From a paper:
Solution of the structure required the preparation of the seleno‐methionine derivative (SeMet‐Pac13) and demonstrated that the enzyme was indeed a cupin.
In pacidamycin 3, biosynthesis the 3′‐deoxy moiety is mediated by Pac13, an enzyme found to catalyze the key dehydration of uridine‐5′‐aldehyde 1 to form 3′‐deoxy‐3′,4′‐didehydrouridine‐5′‐aldehyde 2. In stark contrast to most characterised dehydratases, Pac13 is small (121 aa), monomeric, co‐factor independent and utilises a non‐activated nucleoside, rather than a free monosaccharide, as a substrate. Pac13 is the only monomeric, metal‐free cupin dehydratase characterised to date. We demonstrate here that the reaction most likely proceeds via an E1Cb mechanism, with H42 acting as an active site base, however, unlike many other dehydratases, no metal or cofactor is required for activity.
Residue numbers in the entry: 2 to 121
Amino acid sequence: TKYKYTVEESERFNKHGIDLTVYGQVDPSATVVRVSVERGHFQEFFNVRSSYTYYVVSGQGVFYLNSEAVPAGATDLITVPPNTRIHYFGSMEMVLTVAPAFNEQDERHVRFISESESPY
């Protein structure tokens, strides 16, 4: 059994202004990924099946959850139910849990967000 996954062996890419680290573990109950963000996630989306739970390792930002501003800082936990519109601005390092496991078929695009809208 493979228990340990490393950053060296992960898939690392930029998506809508964030840097994602996808470790490549397979577990139907949850997908855990790393997110690094310099200014924002410049796209609003929702997921019809999975909750999105962000742990803020470091930094400061603001989530927009169904257009409601939710400030976030280091050590905060942001828990987003399924079918909730999400975007965010900030300079932050985060651990993101998607539960149950992320499936691209469950994701929906709402709108792009102008890069000038981030105060970071």
